[PDB]
Amino acid sequence: VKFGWIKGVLVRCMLNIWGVMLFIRLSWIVGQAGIGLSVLVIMMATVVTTITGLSTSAIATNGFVRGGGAYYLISRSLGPEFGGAIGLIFAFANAVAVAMYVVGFAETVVELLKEHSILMIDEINDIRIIGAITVVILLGISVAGMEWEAKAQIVLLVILLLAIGDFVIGTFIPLESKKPKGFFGYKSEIFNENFGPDFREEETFFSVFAIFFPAATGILAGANISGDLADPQSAIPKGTLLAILITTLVYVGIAVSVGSCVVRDATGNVNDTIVTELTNCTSAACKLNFDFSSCESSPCSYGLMNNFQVMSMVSGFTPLISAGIFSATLSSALASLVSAPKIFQALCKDNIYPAFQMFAKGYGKNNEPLRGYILTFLIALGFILIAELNVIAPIISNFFLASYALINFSVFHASLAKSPGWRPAFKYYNMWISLLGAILCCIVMFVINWWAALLTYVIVLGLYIYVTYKKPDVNWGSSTQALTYLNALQHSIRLSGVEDHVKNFRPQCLVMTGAPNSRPALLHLVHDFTKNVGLMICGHVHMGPRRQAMKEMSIDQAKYQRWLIKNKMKAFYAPVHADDLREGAQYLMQAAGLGRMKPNTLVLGFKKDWLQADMRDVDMYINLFHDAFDIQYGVVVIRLKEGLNTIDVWWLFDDGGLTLLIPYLLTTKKKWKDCKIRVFIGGKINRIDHDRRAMATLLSKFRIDFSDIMVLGDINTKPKKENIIAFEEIIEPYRLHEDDKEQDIADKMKEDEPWRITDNELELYKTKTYRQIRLNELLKEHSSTANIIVMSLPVARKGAVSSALYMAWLEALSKDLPPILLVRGNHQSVLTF
Amino acid sequence: AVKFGWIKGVLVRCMLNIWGVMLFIRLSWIVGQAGIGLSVLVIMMATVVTTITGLSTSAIATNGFVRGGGAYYLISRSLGPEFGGAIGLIFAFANAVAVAMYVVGFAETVVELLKEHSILMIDEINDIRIIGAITVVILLGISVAGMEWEAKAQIVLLVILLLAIGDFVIGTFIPLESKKPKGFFGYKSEIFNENFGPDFREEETFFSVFAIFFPAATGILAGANISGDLADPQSAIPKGTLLAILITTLVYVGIAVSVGSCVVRDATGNVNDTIVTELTNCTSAACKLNFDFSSCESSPCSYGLMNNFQVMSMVSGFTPLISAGIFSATLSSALASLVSAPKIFQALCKDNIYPAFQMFAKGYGKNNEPLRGYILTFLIALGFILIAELNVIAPIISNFFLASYALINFSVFHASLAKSPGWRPAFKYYNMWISLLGAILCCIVMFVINWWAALLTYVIVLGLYIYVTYKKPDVNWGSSTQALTYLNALQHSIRLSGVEDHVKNFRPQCLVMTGAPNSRPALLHLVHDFTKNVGLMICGHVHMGPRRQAMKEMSIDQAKYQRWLIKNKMKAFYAPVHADDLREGAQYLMQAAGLGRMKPNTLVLGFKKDWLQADMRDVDMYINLFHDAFDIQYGVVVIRLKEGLNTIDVWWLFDDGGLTLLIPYLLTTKKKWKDCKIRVFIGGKINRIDHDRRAMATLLSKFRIDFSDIMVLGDINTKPKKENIIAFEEIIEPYRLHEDDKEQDIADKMKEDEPWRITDNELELYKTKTYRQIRLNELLKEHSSTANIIVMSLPVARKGAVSSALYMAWLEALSKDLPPILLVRGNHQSVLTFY
């Protein structure tokens, strides 16, 4: 195993390219299109094949390649879905190409048998029998061992080269008996008259090019043996390119030699010699002592345009050329039958399609895919028993063009996504040359057949879609991921370019939910806005040992982010390590995001069970509120029923407009099309008409489309004493009965626990406590039925009120209601203009 | 000052702009050339495209105050400033030349009317020119009087037009015994059947007749162009525009169907023709009742739908009324165009998109009337009338109008696509798909009219686009472009968060901890070389002021430094924070900066040149920052340059993840260092130097680094020169704590009160290390003096093991009087794929 670059790559691919076209139809295409146009066709195929060779060389030299060849190269340089689609397409294409080569062999054998006396059953049936027998022999030689395959390849290569040498030496020497058939030894007049094209039949330049192109195919057999190769980096590039050079030179030289020696038209009748009657005919045959005037209006069985096997006749010892044709065709068939199962093996090993897994088995020491050999045997056998392959030839040609085109596109994509890790170490390549190769392959496959190209395109698209939806886990970093990163970075830079405006103010939320999966209810509620309308950073502070915490954080970021992706959530999980909530919250609030994608609101889940929890946590909560207010953030406190007349807005306190913007953003969603926002405001009595008119005008200026505005004048009134005593007994644990108890002891138990609610605080904020209690009462009795409630949260200066008192206010305001969403903004958010 | 409202400002203006020359002249032509069915189909196509245009402009207008300026403002606040400027200029020109088109149509009608008379001033074309000149002069004169002055005129003109319609209708429902031979019958079903199908006798085809018909449709935006003087555009513009479109298309279809059953296609005005008996071969509807016409294609025929463009006027009783109606329609359309163009051009001039034009935004008068814009439109119209050949340029102006409509629809589609607050049109009856469809049909129709005109319009719009986007003006109004940029950034960041991170796709994402980037440009340039198009550079900066006032200073700093970075070619994000000291702000940034997978993974620090002069607390904080970065698995990169202003060399002394080689390679992938060849220096004992070289080559063969040559040094472990160690001792002497040569108590107290001092125990423990860096410095000086960039693995020491003063002394000694050395240290995670 581990073949060298001469044997593994150069011999294998050089043999694969040389096939049926070289010794049979090359002369025919030279006849159909003149020497110049035939060489132009050969050079078109050469440029497409050369760009493909350069691209596959660029991909192959970028690090080790495990195996599977073209599939591995493309699937690692490009995404796994393109890799899988191309792997399946190319595997099937090579499997069919095995049948195509074998049926070419079989029809050559049938022709050699027809010119002899014997014939077995019939041309087509004998083709079927010969093809079946030969595919069985090919399967046997392939499963006998890859070393035996290599020996067969090299012996067939020397046979083919001897055949070409026989042809050229025969071309040097003319023979008197070959004159009637059309052979003259390098006559300049023949070259002159054959330089022009003459397409007597329906064939056109595009038709001849499409017929010739299959000759150029098969260059990836060098790369398709990547698994069993000593050093693909140094083997694939030089071997492939030199093989392309050698085969194209041979093709052009042979075509020019045949076109310059054999006449376009001629009949085998020896009685056509023109002797001493030099007449007024300017045809290139007249001046060469043989007048083939009959072929103008009579069918002749010889000449370039009529005879396919003129290459055999022109060369001395024509049985040797027949053996050469057999060697070329069988070698190409064996190369295809070896290339297809290996690429299929790699494709199934990567398990892009879980349906196909049995064919990845590694029977033998070299991991030979014997089941792949059987599958390719069956495909080739079927396509041979069909026995009529010319109908599907454009299909396979378009499969090959698709594979080459996506190799070129993989090079262009990997080079476009400027990233470390794309270091091919093949200097001779370019982004634009590869892109040109890709577009050239697409136009060529369209030229060959306009509907086969569409069929191939739709098949590739279908496989792409199927793999995308059936996304498997893939470790190999493709150029798609690099391009995603580069696009994200470029778009972020461009966003940093544009200045901010109050019209396009996006709510950018920093949700302090610890474990996102813990409380998905308010997570979805915060997702109702900040979905295609703003970003959503689900922060999370980690506590514990410093150095080791990163490991935990890493796995956490791996888990929760995945969870966010698993649900239809558009949010980023941004973890930090901090000693306490305030430190990590400050980390995030200070340096979260980048560019202009910075959070501007701190969405906080309401701290349920604040009574049971340690009071240090509650004071931490209130200090977090204050920190958010100090850094110019908009706090949003959300209270839900986590275990499990539509939307109400309470524009009690004026701010930039966040308390009104959020309800509107909630309305424009599929869950709540029927929004029907009911707006409320605290207006003095005997002014409700004026306040309602003014608020309706303002809400028309900001197009929010309320349902009906209501004005309340009872918001600041003494509430029912039952609720007052409920609030008092709720606070009772956190009271500071300084007046009742002795001054010294009260000071002692106040300084050690500064969160205690001084009676002075209660006497100063009795009005505010009544306000919150009354707001809760009137809201509960009025809007008991509603799907969302929004209100402006109360705010007190840091240290002015105890954390216990502030949390008591928050809890009393939203004691037991439908989902409530208290809001507070900083700067202007909604603009009439 | 003046506020018309939808009753007069919008409805009347667009009503009278849609109606124009063709409403009576060429309508017979289209209904005859194309059957009633095909004529109504063409009317439906024009009506639907104009209807989506009206819906889209209504959606744009209803969104907030539209201020004043017309379609320019609507398309410039809903879309980028450059699209706005381009369409403003193009639509202003199109309306200005439409003034001339309507004036020359009026002149054509007048010259034909007086050619019916024997009077002729000079010549048909000369008389057309003179009539057009007089009409445009008086048109300007009436227009300059005031915006309210036409208010009466328009409406009275309107009733005249409407009364003319009535005249035609009452003419349709009464046949006259004397005028049967001159084309029409008394509303017979035979005429309806005969004229139902199409008959394109001349080269005119379906597309040709559609293009002939379309110019009538245009004119809806003239109501929106009065947005400057209009009470409440938000509510007014939708009602006026939609009702005007509905009523004008209804009247068009009504007149088309009425004419389609009244006048035969071909009719020779010969009274002598008349039949008396039934005959076989007269399938023509003419013979059906009284009068038979024949051979109007083989002889010069006189009347008929497809011959006489004024046949409708003959059908209409009391031809003077319908003639006055034609004059009223064309003049009213001219007024609408000449009032729409100056206002839109004034709005274009106000925003200073094109510095060349500035005088047209004067708006002299209390009504803010652009008199200079009026004069410009007058000059353009006078010239285009003097051309007197408007058929050649008609496709150009039609395509201008169609481009305006198309990009209005696309403005709606773009604003709706960029899901954003502030896009609350409140006009329910619209749809983003409908707007996109309208734009596509506008594009297809402008291509269908004439391909060459469409190409000219497209390239002109693209040229204006490029000019305005290159000459970016001082504009900020949160256009849909900015909203879509934000939405694209967010969506792409989410997608990136979707994908995993691979070694093969590793990137150097640098957090450059250097405040005030302009302070240290050169350093950033070197950081930019290996982070441009390969990673993200976050130019961090901590704010040291008091907390209360720190926010405004931070905002000013961020704005001005982002503007500075964008002014240069720099591709970096300025991320400032506030902290009690440099270390805490660095911790903030290293813990939170960047969202998703776009977060830093290396910390780039400039070398502390003034560590000798500066207070030792800052240097200790510098080293503490080094250690903190190492704690969070960051890779430190210390860069030292000469701030006042042959190949690259690498020193892979210590094996890290692989950054030490990745940075030089990325440097070589740039035009600045494209020619530089990565020489490599490593450490290896003498007896196995060659093997080491071989090994290194193989390593650099696996990672395709493409070096030049490898030099193995085995002397790095040897003692350095005595002079160099003497210099090192002199350097560190001020920070020395001579505990060996002083009493234990004084040395101890100097230690705790001054913890950063270098105790002689550290010196005796790390003599080997100190000699290592001194030797490395001297061999750097002798071996790689002439090198553009030097890369070295910086030393590391455990926290507390070595004094920060001594560590900074090592950093100082490792690089003295050297080219731009670049010390590196990876985070022990492999960054070179190997596969």
Ligand SMILES: CCCCNc1cc(C(=O)O)cc(S(N)(=O)=O)c1Oc1ccccc1
């Ligand atoms: C993707 C091409 C698959 C290989 N088959 C191909 C090979 C060559 C050649 O010389 O390599 C020439 C042709 S050819 N002269 O165009 O017909 C071939 O098409 C065939 C052959 C025989 C039957 C039907 C189709």
Ligand SMILES: CCCCNc1cc(C(=O)O)cc(S(N)(=O)=O)c1Oc1ccccc1
């Ligand atoms: C590691 C937790 C970091 C975020 N903390 C957060 C987590 C969660 C949750 O479960 O994800 C719920 C709340 S809360 N207000 O109860 O809904 C939390 O706010 C706290 C928690 C304790 C002290 C102070 C504030």
Ligand SMILES: CCCCNc1cc(C(=O)O)cc(S(N)(=O)=O)c1Oc1ccccc1
């Ligand atoms: C886009 C609008 C251009 C204005 N002129 C235009 C107006 C109307 C109409 O109905 O207001 C009809 C036509 S027309 N004969 O139907 O194609 C017009 O093209 C003319 C007319 C006469 C002179 C030159 C050009």
Ligand SMILES: [K+]
């Ligand atoms: K081939």
Ligand SMILES: [K+]
């Ligand atoms: K018009």
